[PDB]
Amino acid sequence: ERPTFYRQELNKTIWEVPERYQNLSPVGSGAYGSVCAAFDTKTGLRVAVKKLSRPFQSIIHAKRTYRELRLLKHMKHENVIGLLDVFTPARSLEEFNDVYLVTHLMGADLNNIVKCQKLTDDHVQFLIYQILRGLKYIHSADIIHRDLKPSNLAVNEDCELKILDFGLARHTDDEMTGYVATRWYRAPEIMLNWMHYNQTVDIWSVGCIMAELLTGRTLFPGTDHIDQLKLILRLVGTPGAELLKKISSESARNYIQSLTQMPKMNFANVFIGANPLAVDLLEKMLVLDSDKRITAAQALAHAYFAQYHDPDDEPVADPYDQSFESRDLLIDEWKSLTYDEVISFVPPPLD
Numbered sequence: 210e211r212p213t214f215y216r217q218e219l220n221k222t223i224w225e226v227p228e229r230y231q232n233l234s235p236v237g238s239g240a241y242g243s244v245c246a247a248f249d250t251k252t253g254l255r256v257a258v259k260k261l262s263r264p265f266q267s268i269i270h271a272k273r274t275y276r277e278l279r280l281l282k283h284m285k286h287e288n289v290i291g292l293l294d295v296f297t298p299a300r301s302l303e304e305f306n307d308v309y310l311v312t313h314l315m316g317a318d319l320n321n322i323v324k325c326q327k328l329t330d331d332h333v334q335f336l337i338y339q340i341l342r343g344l345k346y347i348h349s350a351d352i353i354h355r356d357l358k359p360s361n362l363a364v365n366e367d368c369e370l371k372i373l374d375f376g377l378a379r380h381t382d383d384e385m386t387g388y389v390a391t392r393w394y395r396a397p398e399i400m401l402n403w404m405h406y407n408q409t410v411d412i413w414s415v416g417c418i419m420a421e422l423l424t425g426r427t428l429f430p431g432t433d434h435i436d437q438l439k440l441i442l443r444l445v446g447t448p449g450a451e452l453l454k455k456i457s458s459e460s461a462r463n464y465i466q467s468l469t470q471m472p473k474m475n476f477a478n479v480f481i482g483a484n485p486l487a488v489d490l491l492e493k494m495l496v497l498d499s500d501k502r503i504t505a506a507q508a509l510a511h512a513y514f515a516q517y518h519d520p521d522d523e524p525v526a527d528p529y530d531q532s533f534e535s536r537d538l539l540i541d542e543w544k545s546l547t548y549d550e551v552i553s554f555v556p557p558p559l560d
């Protein structure tokens with residue numbers, strides 16, 4: 210039944226893991242946990258193991274922990290990250306305090322690819338294709354990523370691509386401040402809090418990512434929130450009256466109307482030399498009104514992806530029950546909910 214655990218300290222943190230996992234080596238940490246690379250001897254895999262940092266600190270924390278576990282137990286798709294394993298050294302609910310998550314070891318992110326390599330149009334096709342493929346899956350489970358950027362995309366030597374979230378820290382006001390990649394890929398409505406937002410926020414990010422794969426340059430490297438809004442409105446144009454009504458923040462609405470009105474730019478004169486089909490796709494992604502952005506599913510059928518598109522191999526997620534998001538529970542209740550999910554986990558099969 211239960212495997213044997215051994216202990217070791219790595220960077221003032223104690224790790225207790227099953228013997229199967231060997232050669233633990235620290236790779237990163239933050240307020241929400243620490244990660245080691247390791248070798249899983251039962252599967253033959255290089256794996257990553259995250260140890261959650263006091264997962265049941267507060268109500269809000271415990272619920273956060275439950276949420277990621279549920280989330281990761283559910284993601285089963287080639288272009289999305291999955292759970293290899295999840296474990297606890299705890300022998301009963303009474304002593305459950307620590308949670309460990311196991312995933313495939315990710316090496317290079319997409320930020321490393323565009324930085325250190327020249328990409329062909331065909332490269333960009335395959336890379337964006339896979340993001341959209343994964344995103345169709347994620348969205349069909351009513352999950353929004355909200356933080357799509359190159360660094361949250363893992364890419365191996367064959368340009369095969371997985372969406373995940375490496376994030377280990379709080380998403381605070383300070384990290385979104387200033388000249389920071391954290392904010393360059395954010396949909397404007399979620400950056401200036403215009404309104405209740407939706408799936409299409411992630412599509413805007415793909416817009417920004419695709420542009421950067423084509424040029425090798427950040428699309429909207431704002432020096433701050435407002436500077437970035439100007440860079441954005443310079444390209445796609447200031448909003449019309451139709452879009453202004455949909456902006457719930459009267460204060461935000463009011464700021465936008467103080468701007469000099471500008472037309473949408475010619476994208477062929479921005480993305481000089483790009484495939485006309487890439488240009489067209491960007492025009493349908495980088496749309497200010499989120500009601501009117503192309504969806505992941507719609508985007509898969511666009512002629513830019515003709516080499517790769519296969520409507521029989523672009524699967525959707527099983528129904529995902531997200532009713533817990535509405536419930537207010539106590540720490541011990543989130544905790545036990547989490548514990549059930551730990552003990553019920555069934556590992557994936559390798560072929």
Ligand SMILES: CC(C)(C)c1cc(NC(=O)Nc2ccc(Cl)c(COc3cccnc3)c2)[nH]n1
Nearest residue numbers: 244257258259290310312314315354372373374
């Ligand atoms: C929207 C999607 C489904 C993409 C999403 C994913 C997440 N969160 C995570 O992916 N979390 C997570 C948890 C544990 C581990 Cl081990 C990892 C991968 O971490 C590494 C670190 C270093 C090298 N390789 C993998 C991710 N939220 N939303």
